[PDB]
Amino acid sequence: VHLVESGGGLVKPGGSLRLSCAASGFTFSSYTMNWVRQAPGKGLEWVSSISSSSTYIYYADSVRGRFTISRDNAKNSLYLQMNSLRAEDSAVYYCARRAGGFDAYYFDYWGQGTLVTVSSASTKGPSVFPLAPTSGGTAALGCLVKDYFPEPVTVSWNSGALTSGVHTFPAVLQSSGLYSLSSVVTVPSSSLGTQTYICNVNHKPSNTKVDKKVEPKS
Amino acid sequence: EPSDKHIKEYLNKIQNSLSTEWSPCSVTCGNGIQVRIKPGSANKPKDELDYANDIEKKICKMEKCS
Amino acid sequence: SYELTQPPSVSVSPGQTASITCSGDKLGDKFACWYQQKPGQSPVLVIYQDTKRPSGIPERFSGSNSGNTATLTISGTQAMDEADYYCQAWDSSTVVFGGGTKVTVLGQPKAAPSVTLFPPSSEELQANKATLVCLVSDFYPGAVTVAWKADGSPVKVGVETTKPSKQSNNKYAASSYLSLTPEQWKSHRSYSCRVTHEGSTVEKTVAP
């Protein structure tokens, strides 16, 4: 069972945004589905639920009249249309499947969440620079992802084929108001001038992806 | 009285066999419950069945109390 | 419910039993559920319908719901159980979450940080910018001092350092960025990242 949320990004105060949740590995058409959100560093807050047939829909008081839940049983997908958004609405938005019956309800599967940032600041895509490669048999190389807004940025290596030894660090919020982060891989020193190393940086909120080749230092 | 909570617990226990027909008693000793989906609710999807509106209930006494 | 109250924080040592209560008007009539959330991850169901455990959850997690109080109890609390825990119930179709309870496991072993320092890349230098990147990983507890030196003297202007964040393995990570101009980078013989942790220090140096 997989729940994959999408659509998070920057929205101006008073603006609108549509989130999506694509479900896999179970009979979507037979479950009640929910949106739950979590502001940074704060607690979980239920947003909305929609029954299988879309007949029974409920909303938290905090969003009633501004948000619209919906589903396309066809594409095993759930949607959340948000309007008149405020800064208080900035949060990670989670898709969650309801289980149980007759008031004994719980959420047994959750997505990884999509981040919504409500701000009057402006989008900025990242500048990616190689961190060229030691510790005996292993060496460290990386990618610097500088000066982007909003969060988040995700980083893969060699298109997901390199997962071992990868450490993507939490981003720093600069004086700037922009974010920077670094991704580092511990790789064999035996293959620095042979193995191809490419960091795949995705910054969905600015519709930008960068595949940066990391080469041994000239 | 068989509590609503105890009835809800039983409905979740038999969530796969719950049907339009009366279920077995929920207890081996004491005052239990028998439940069925109301005839007027038989066509509702499973996730939309409501405890108050869609479930019929009836007390049943068992005495396996040794 | 319609207002669930958990304590903000619970602290125990390894091996002893952690107890988190969750209070609500008439909660005994409801079905309490519990979620574990580690930093940077989605919630995970650990107890549902008061007392039941999902298949893959260790036996040391247990739940109860009596009177108007639900309780999560972790027997033999391990370091891996450090996390935020949320109680949850249904009321009027409205889903109510407790405020969350952070469980801290006291007295875990110290772990010294690994430090990696990268100089500015030639591509950044060509774009008229220069950033030094100091990466600090796998330390515990999560309290560090990161300082920067230029030619052996303290540098503070232009430094941006994150708060330590919990890793996969319950250890902490942090990073520090020193933003320079290409002229400053070339002006000094060396730059250093000095990381002090529990009275011991690791210093890495780079030279243009």
XYZ file of C-alpha atoms in Angstrom:
492
model
C 0.000 0.000 0.000
C 1.392 3.375 -1.106
C 0.042 6.911 -0.714
C 1.939 9.603 -2.626
C 0.996 13.258 -2.144
C 1.835 15.981 -4.642
C 1.221 19.636 -5.418
C 2.850 21.354 -2.455
C 4.685 24.603 -3.004
C 4.557 28.344 -2.538
C 1.199 30.137 -2.521
C 0.587 33.818 -1.845
C -1.636 34.882 1.066
C -5.220 34.640 -0.109
C -4.284 32.247 -2.897
C -5.331 28.778 -3.969
C -3.573 25.441 -4.374
C -4.664 21.896 -5.282
C -3.046 18.867 -3.644
C -3.221 15.313 -4.971
C -2.736 11.884 -3.389
C -2.164 8.875 -5.652
C -2.915 5.538 -3.978
C -1.614 2.107 -4.964
C -1.818 -1.455 -3.722
C -5.368 -1.578 -2.369
C -8.981 -1.116 -3.458
C -9.087 2.675 -3.187
C -12.770 2.718 -4.115
C -13.720 0.968 -0.864
C -12.049 3.187 1.761
C -12.728 6.502 3.443
C -9.742 8.804 2.942
C -8.454 11.752 4.935
C -6.159 14.747 4.832
C -4.148 15.514 7.962
C -1.614 18.354 8.247
C 1.258 19.284 10.534
C 2.775 22.747 10.830
C 6.559 22.764 11.229
C 7.522 21.661 14.721
C 3.896 21.368 15.845
C 1.294 18.631 16.201
C -1.021 16.698 13.919
C -4.277 18.385 12.880
C -7.026 16.574 11.009
C -8.236 18.459 7.934
C -10.944 16.509 6.095
C -12.416 13.109 5.308
C -14.310 11.780 2.289
C -16.212 8.477 2.138
C -15.724 5.917 -0.630
C -18.788 7.081 -2.578
C -18.069 10.754 -1.767
C -21.432 10.844 0.022
C -20.121 11.650 3.534
C -17.691 14.584 3.702
C -16.497 16.322 6.865
C -14.135 19.227 7.554
C -12.218 20.648 10.485
C -13.622 23.940 11.754
C -10.285 25.578 10.914
C -10.773 24.993 7.172
C -14.548 24.751 6.756
C -15.640 26.958 3.876
C -12.184 27.358 2.349
C -11.084 23.794 1.516
C -12.772 21.239 -0.743
C -11.967 17.532 -0.556
C -12.745 15.323 -3.524
C -11.747 12.025 -5.057
C -11.496 10.365 -8.441
C -12.013 6.696 -7.630
C -11.002 6.290 -11.262
C -7.385 7.334 -10.861
C -7.082 5.926 -7.326
C -6.539 9.561 -6.362
C -7.678 11.962 -3.649
C -7.662 15.743 -3.956
C -7.667 18.763 -1.646
C -8.558 22.173 -3.124
C -7.451 24.982 -0.809
C -8.586 28.591 -1.217
C -8.153 31.807 0.765
C -4.964 30.340 2.194
C -3.261 31.972 5.179
C 0.156 31.587 6.783
C -1.415 29.449 9.528
C -2.099 26.903 6.748
C 1.624 26.331 6.092
C 2.252 22.675 6.920
C 3.070 19.243 5.623
C -0.176 17.817 4.248
C -0.575 14.048 4.669
C -2.899 11.637 2.886
C -4.189 8.941 5.240
C -6.394 5.879 4.839
C -9.123 5.289 7.413
C -9.673 1.769 8.761
C -11.999 0.187 11.277
C -15.740 0.433 11.689
C -18.494 1.922 13.799
C -16.674 4.764 15.577
C -13.585 2.564 16.164
C -11.674 4.309 13.400
C -7.938 4.745 12.850
C -5.433 5.674 10.115
C -3.432 2.581 9.158
C -1.450 4.030 6.232
C 0.007 7.501 5.681
C 1.811 9.174 2.807
C 5.153 10.929 3.122
C 3.423 14.309 2.880
C 3.679 17.379 0.666
C 4.834 20.734 2.025
C 2.671 23.839 1.524
C 4.306 27.220 2.141
C 2.061 30.302 2.314
C 4.268 33.377 1.992
C 4.524 36.673 0.163
C 8.195 35.934 -0.629
C 9.005 34.842 -4.177
C 10.001 31.499 -5.640
C 13.683 30.899 -6.319
C 15.145 27.763 -7.845
C 18.485 26.399 -6.660
C 22.052 26.721 -7.870
C 23.724 23.305 -7.706
C 27.496 23.067 -7.368
C 29.633 19.919 -7.097
C 31.441 19.115 -3.848
C 34.390 17.289 -5.407
C 35.995 14.326 -3.557
C 39.341 11.022 1.624
C 39.207 8.304 4.320
C 41.294 5.331 3.170
C 39.034 3.035 1.170
C 36.171 5.552 1.065
C 35.931 9.213 0.108
C 33.206 11.833 0.456
C 31.704 13.760 -2.441
C 28.575 15.844 -2.576
C 26.357 18.488 -4.114
C 25.688 21.939 -2.700
C 22.126 23.120 -3.330
C 22.219 26.837 -2.663
C 19.741 29.692 -2.337
C 16.315 28.241 -3.089
C 12.815 28.990 -1.806
C 10.532 27.528 -0.633
C 11.363 24.128 0.782
C 11.642 21.320 -0.051
C 14.430 19.996 -2.219
C 15.039 16.282 -2.735
C 18.302 14.762 -3.906
C 18.960 11.397 -5.548
C 22.259 9.994 -6.813
C 22.739 8.273 -10.175
C 18.954 8.265 -10.636
C 18.358 6.222 -7.492
C 20.919 3.544 -8.343
C 23.206 4.951 -5.609
C 21.516 4.708 -2.217
C 24.326 3.376 -0.010
C 26.252 5.931 1.997
C 23.984 8.833 1.027
C 23.329 11.527 3.640
C 21.239 14.533 2.618
C 21.462 17.117 5.406
C 18.609 19.305 6.685
C 18.563 22.683 4.989
C 19.879 25.862 6.574
C 17.706 28.970 6.533
C 20.084 31.801 5.707
C 19.878 35.445 6.741
C 18.873 35.786 3.083
C 15.555 34.121 3.711
C 16.633 31.480 1.203
C 17.522 27.859 1.937
C 20.644 25.833 1.207
C 21.419 22.174 1.759
C 24.090 19.595 0.977
C 23.968 15.953 -0.070
C 27.041 13.797 0.568
C 27.889 10.261 -0.554
C 30.569 8.004 0.927
C 31.952 6.142 -2.088
C 35.013 3.970 -2.798
C 38.141 5.990 -3.505
C 38.935 3.240 -6.035
C 36.335 4.611 -8.486
C 36.601 8.403 -8.214
C 38.045 8.888 -11.698
C 35.938 6.106 -13.194
C 32.487 5.886 -11.620
C 30.034 8.515 -12.835
C 28.520 10.532 -9.983
C 25.446 12.645 -10.722
C 23.284 14.235 -8.056
C 19.659 14.554 -9.147
C 18.210 17.647 -7.458
C 14.437 18.164 -7.665
C 12.896 21.474 -6.566
C 9.233 20.917 -7.396
C 8.042 24.285 -6.000
C 9.928 26.094 -8.799
C 9.421 23.399 -11.482
C 13.181 22.838 -11.681
C 15.388 19.747 -11.727
C 19.167 19.634 -12.044
C 21.367 16.606 -12.781
C 24.837 17.800 -11.757
C 27.912 15.715 -12.582
C 30.428 15.552 -9.725
C 33.972 15.052 -11.026
C 37.329 14.543 -9.284
C 38.957 17.861 -8.435
C 40.967 19.256 -11.345
C -26.720 -3.443 29.798
C -24.470 -4.397 26.862
C -22.607 -1.110 26.373
C -22.435 0.658 23.026
C -18.660 0.348 23.338
C -18.942 -3.420 23.755
C -21.321 -3.588 20.806
C -18.923 -1.548 18.670
C -16.070 -3.843 19.708
C -18.106 -6.848 18.563
C -19.036 -5.254 15.227
C -15.329 -4.751 14.522
C -14.645 -8.362 15.536
C -17.114 -9.697 12.954
C -16.482 -6.919 10.428
C -16.065 -9.594 7.733
C -19.195 -11.641 8.518
C -21.587 -8.781 9.368
C -24.630 -9.169 7.144
C -28.399 -8.684 6.818
C -28.930 -11.732 9.064
C -28.737 -11.790 12.848
C -25.259 -12.587 14.127
C -24.389 -14.948 16.983
C -24.421 -13.611 20.515
C -21.430 -11.428 21.327
C -20.751 -13.129 24.688
C -20.386 -16.578 26.228
C -21.654 -15.490 29.671
C -23.894 -12.569 30.550
C -26.008 -10.199 28.484
C -24.584 -9.859 24.994
C -25.847 -8.522 21.699
C -26.899 -9.780 18.288
C -26.505 -7.362 15.384
C -27.471 -7.182 11.727
C -27.469 -4.547 9.002
C -30.921 -2.987 8.738
C -32.808 -4.006 5.554
C -32.943 -0.366 4.450
C -29.143 -0.154 4.795
C -28.161 -3.341 2.945
C -26.946 -1.421 -0.124
C -24.665 1.051 1.656
C -20.918 0.521 1.108
C -19.151 -1.000 4.102
C -17.210 2.125 5.042
C -20.417 4.215 5.172
C -22.352 2.002 7.610
C -23.316 4.081 10.660
C -23.630 2.581 14.133
C -26.799 4.448 15.108
C -28.666 4.415 11.796
C -27.649 1.224 9.989
C -27.227 -1.454 12.684
C -30.118 -3.257 14.345
C -29.418 -4.707 17.789
C -31.056 -7.233 20.110
C -30.075 -8.447 23.572
C -29.058 -12.098 23.980
C -28.352 -13.919 27.239
C -25.756 -16.685 27.529
C -24.890 -18.729 30.602
C -21.553 -20.445 29.967
C -20.502 -19.096 33.350
C -18.971 -22.086 35.154
C -12.681 13.787 23.561
C -13.245 16.870 21.371
C -10.165 18.068 23.277
C -7.513 15.418 24.080
C -4.779 16.237 26.608
C -1.370 14.547 26.705
C 1.699 15.714 28.659
C 4.217 17.683 26.584
C 7.171 15.449 27.466
C 8.077 12.154 29.132
C 11.624 11.195 30.154
C 12.917 7.759 31.176
C 16.146 5.766 31.211
C 16.726 2.690 29.026
C 14.940 -0.433 30.183
C 12.321 1.209 32.394
C 8.672 1.690 31.522
C 7.471 4.887 29.869
C 3.839 5.879 30.387
C 1.944 8.493 28.379
C -1.597 9.417 29.378
C -4.258 10.998 27.169
C -7.258 12.622 28.839
C -10.674 13.472 27.433
C -14.271 13.899 28.569
C -15.929 10.501 28.136
C -12.816 9.091 26.434
C -13.575 5.733 28.048
C -16.546 5.515 25.678
C -14.280 6.024 22.635
C -11.558 3.998 20.906
C -8.129 5.540 21.464
C -5.343 5.135 18.901
C -1.646 5.946 19.168
C 0.897 7.075 16.564
C 4.686 7.216 16.725
C 6.405 9.921 14.670
C 10.190 10.082 14.393
C 11.782 13.346 13.173
C 11.365 13.893 9.454
C 9.035 10.920 8.975
C 5.325 10.192 8.658
C 3.291 8.966 11.647
C 3.192 5.225 12.287
C 0.268 3.490 13.998
C 1.408 1.636 17.110
C -1.905 0.987 18.940
C -5.474 1.099 17.643
C -8.879 0.441 19.220
C -7.462 0.958 22.716
C -5.319 -2.162 22.977
C -4.613 -3.794 19.591
C -1.122 -3.821 18.065
C -0.465 -3.803 14.301
C 1.347 -6.889 13.070
C 4.805 -5.338 12.849
C 4.882 -3.375 16.109
C 7.018 -4.735 18.980
C 5.278 -6.322 21.951
C 6.712 -3.760 24.388
C 4.059 -1.281 23.200
C 0.703 -1.643 24.946
C -2.415 0.446 25.284
C -5.269 0.792 27.734
C -8.408 2.905 28.006
C -10.234 3.116 31.345
C -12.346 5.790 32.971
C -11.616 8.910 30.915
C -7.911 8.235 30.356
C -6.077 6.303 27.658
C -2.484 5.255 28.285
C 0.370 4.182 26.043
C 2.969 2.156 27.946
C 6.382 1.233 26.539
C 8.029 -1.504 28.592
C 11.800 -1.756 28.450
C 12.042 1.578 26.677
C 14.876 1.468 24.140
C 16.686 4.399 22.552
C 14.970 3.592 19.234
C 11.631 4.427 20.919
C 12.580 8.113 21.170
C 9.864 9.895 19.200
C 6.762 12.047 19.376
C 3.620 10.106 20.305
C 0.078 11.239 19.472
C -3.165 9.892 20.910
C -6.241 10.016 18.704
C -9.973 9.425 19.016
C -13.180 10.050 17.076
C -15.891 12.475 18.165
C -18.912 13.470 16.062
C -17.016 12.402 12.897
C -14.414 14.998 13.902
C -11.013 13.329 14.301
C -9.236 14.667 17.379
C -5.501 14.315 17.979
C -3.847 14.918 21.305
C -1.172 17.576 21.429
C 1.680 15.067 21.198
C 4.197 13.785 23.736
C 7.956 13.741 23.141
C 9.603 10.754 24.846
C 13.271 11.279 25.710
C 15.500 8.332 26.633
C 18.014 9.483 29.249
C 21.636 8.435 29.557
C 22.466 7.111 26.106
C 26.136 6.665 25.150
C 28.144 9.629 23.935
C 29.204 9.601 20.279
C 31.830 11.892 18.768
C 31.057 13.752 15.528
C 32.377 12.999 12.075
C 33.332 16.230 10.289
C 33.615 16.775 6.536
C 34.705 20.131 5.116
C 34.490 21.063 1.442
C 36.141 24.123 -0.171
C 34.422 26.273 -2.799
C 34.039 24.552 -6.139
C 35.694 26.055 -9.183
C 32.239 26.390 -10.760
C 31.026 28.496 -7.838
C 34.230 30.561 -7.912
C 33.544 31.225 -11.600
C 30.071 32.515 -10.649
C 31.696 35.130 -8.366
C 30.742 33.298 -5.160
C 32.366 30.983 -2.640
C 30.830 28.785 0.052
C 32.686 26.605 2.562
C 30.566 23.624 3.639
C 31.153 21.922 7.011
C 29.098 18.784 7.659
C 28.818 17.227 11.116
C 27.249 13.812 11.638
C 26.659 10.986 14.100
C 27.094 12.821 17.397
C 25.211 12.461 20.671
C 24.022 14.324 22.624
C 22.730 16.876 20.134
C 24.703 19.830 21.451
C 27.676 21.086 19.414
C 29.646 24.268 18.882
C 30.744 24.977 15.309
C 33.327 27.738 14.908
C 35.258 28.918 11.858
C 38.839 30.156 11.599
C 40.714 32.003 8.864
C 44.518 31.820 9.122
C 44.124 30.566 12.669
C 41.942 33.460 13.851
C 38.212 33.348 14.659
C 35.778 34.214 11.869
C 32.116 34.911 12.624
C 30.770 37.150 9.835
C 29.054 35.174 7.094
C 28.565 31.936 9.018
C 25.206 30.128 8.924
C 24.788 27.050 11.142
C 21.785 24.761 11.570
C 20.386 23.368 14.791
C 21.339 19.696 15.259
C 18.666 17.331 13.937
C 18.048 13.695 14.790
C 19.260 11.123 12.284
C 18.058 7.657 11.293
C 20.148 6.043 14.043
C 19.022 8.454 16.793
C 22.288 10.433 16.496
C 22.448 14.077 15.458
C 23.516 15.943 12.325
C 24.287 19.592 11.688
C 25.866 21.671 8.950
C 27.547 25.061 8.808
C 28.105 27.342 5.822
C 30.684 30.121 5.555
C 29.859 32.436 2.651
C 32.811 34.353 1.225
C 33.763 36.277 -1.876
C 36.312 34.681 -4.214
C 38.728 37.438 -3.158
C 38.480 36.557 0.539
C 38.855 32.847 -0.251
C 42.096 33.489 -2.145
C 43.341 35.995 0.453
C 43.945 33.523 3.297
C 46.310 30.579 3.525
C 43.684 28.369 5.151
C 40.164 28.127 6.543
C 39.106 25.760 9.301
C 35.891 24.289 10.724
C 36.238 23.593 14.460
C 33.596 21.339 16.035
C 33.504 21.050 19.841
C 31.431 18.241 21.375
C 31.366 17.228 25.038
C 34.697 18.896 25.707
C 36.529 17.309 22.750
C 37.182 19.014 19.426
C 37.593 17.970 15.787
C 39.054 20.505 13.340
C 39.355 20.157 9.574
C 41.232 22.638 7.397
C 41.127 23.558 3.703
C 43.604 25.660 1.732
C 43.008 27.532 -1.575
